[PDB]
A paper describes a structure:
Whereas yeasts only have one Aurora kinase, metazoans generally have two, named Aurora A and B. Mammals, but not other vertebrates, also have a third family member, Aurora C. Aurora A localizes to centrosomes and spindle microtubules and plays important roles in centrosome maturation, controlling spindle length and bipolarity, asymmetric cell division, and promoting mitotic entry both in unperturbed cells and following DNA damage. Aurora A has multiple regulators, with the best-studied one being TPX2, which activates the kinase and targets it to spindle microtubules. As in the case of Aurora B, phosphorylation of this threonine [which readily occurs in vitro even in the absence of TPX2 or other activators (16)] promotes high levels of kinase activity. The Aurora kinases therefore emerged as attractive drug targets in cancer and became the focus of intense drug discovery efforts.
To gain insight into the remarkable biochemical potency and Aurora A-selective nature of the MK-8745/MK-5108 class of compounds, we determined the 2.2 Å X-ray crystal structure of the human Aurora A kinase domain bound to MK-5108. In the inhibitor complex, the Aurora A kinase domain adopts an inactive conformation in which both the αC helix (orange) and particularly the activation loop (yellow) are improperly positioned for catalysis. Electron density maps indicate that both Thr 287 (which adopts two alternate conformations; only one is illustrated) and Thr 288 are phosphorylated, showing that the inhibitor is able to interact with the activated form of the enzyme. Consistent with its action as an ATP-competitive inhibitor, MK-5108 inserts itself into the nucleotide-binding pocket between the two lobes of the kinase in the same orientation as its parent compound VX-680. The picomolar affinity of MK-5108 for Aurora A is explained by the extensive polar and van der Waals interactions it forms with 22 residues throughout the active site. The 2-fluoro, 3-chlorophenol on the opposite end of the inhibitor packs against the side chains of the catalytic lysine (Lys 162), precluding its active conformation, as well as against Phe 275 of the DFG motif. This interaction stabilizes a flipped, inactive conformation of the DFG motif that is intermediate between the active “DFG-in” state and the canonical “DFG-out” conformation. Importantly, the 2-fluoro, 3-chlorophenol moiety of MK-5108 forms a likely highly energetically favorable edge-face aromatic pi stacking interaction with the indole of Trp 277. The interaction between MK-5108 and the side chain of Trp 277 has the effect of “pinning down” the activation loop at its N-terminal end and disfavors its adoption of an active conformation.
Residue numbers in the entry: 127 to 280, 286 to 390
Write the structure that this text describes.
């Protein structure tokens, strides 16, 4: 159905992994959107071509205000095109770099939006969202948009991004939606501190620190934040909180801007 000629392509928004993304406009409807270009050769070489295919298929049936909407996709012999919701304010990652760390209010609000999205995802049996700051885009009102279409990987090939992977994903082959509770904890930490909790010199050391749940807090992290993060970063996934509990955490309640 869709083809490149169905769109009026504008300026490049930026260069990402596997290709550029363009501000664009569907011809007939004049609807403004983002067009992500992905080169098949780079997808194959990076080992993520099958993940991307699965993700675009799953997410084509999903709709949530804090998930970057995927309107559709198409391909030729060379490239894959994603027709995406346009998120004007770019990645949370750039803001995190600019500011070094976020305050508790912006953080709790981000954690809220992420928790709502992940709750929706789980109801749809969609799990293990790679919600690292690079994959978090910003709507025109500063609302967070999960934009993970399966293009990061890390014997067995693991899906996602090392610093955010839970112990069960690195130690074993079985895991459920509780992995998304672990990620939420890493992100909350990262938001407040400026770096993820298990950051180490090498992959292997990161691999081991995650297994041991070996991390420390800086002194400035408040008690409520530490409490949430500590609950989220539990080794046994069965011991991790449910998303409802997160959304009703006193530190979240006391600090988030929205339900
Ligand atoms: O410089 C930046 O901030 C960007 C480009 C950029 C800058 C400003 C706004 C913007 N808005 C957008 N709305 C939808 C897609 S991009 N996009 C670099 C490329 C990056 O590429 C991606 C990253 C993760 C997931 C996805 Cl779908 C990506 F397309 C997006 C941020």
């Amino acid at each position: 159905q869709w083809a490149l000629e169905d769109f009026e392509i504008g300026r490049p928004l930026g260069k990402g992994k596997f290709g550029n993304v363009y501000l664009a406009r569907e011809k007939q409807s004049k609807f403004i959107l983002a067009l992500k270009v992905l080169f098949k050769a780079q997808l194959e070489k990076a080992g993520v071509e099958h993940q991307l295919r699965r993700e675009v298929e799953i997410q084509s049936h999903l709709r949530h205000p804090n998930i970057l909407r995927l309107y559709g996709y198409f391909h030729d012999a060379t490239r894959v095109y994603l027709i995406l919701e346009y998120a004007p304010l770019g990645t949370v990652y750039r803001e995190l770099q600019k500011l070094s760390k976020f305050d508790e209010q912006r953080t709790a609000t981000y954690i809220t939006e992420l928790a709502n999205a992940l709750s929706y995802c789980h109801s749809k049996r969609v799990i293990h969202r790679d919600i690292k700051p690079e994959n978090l885009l910003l709507g025109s009102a500063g609302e967070l948009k999960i934009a993970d279409f399966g293009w990061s990987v890390h014997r067995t090939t693991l899906c996602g991004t090392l610093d955010y992977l839970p112990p069960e994903m690195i130690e074993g082959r079985m895991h459920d939606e509780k992995v998304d509770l672990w990620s939420l904890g890493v992100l909350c930490y990262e938001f407040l501190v400026g770096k993820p909790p298990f950051e180490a010199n090498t992959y292997q050391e990161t691999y081991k620190r995650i297994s041991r749940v070996e991390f420390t807090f800086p002194d400035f992290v408040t008690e409520g934040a530490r409490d949430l993060i500590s609950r989220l970063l539990k080794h046994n996934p069965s011991q991790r909180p449910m998303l409802r509990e997160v959304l009703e955490h006193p530190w979240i309640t006391a600090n988030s801007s929205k339900p």
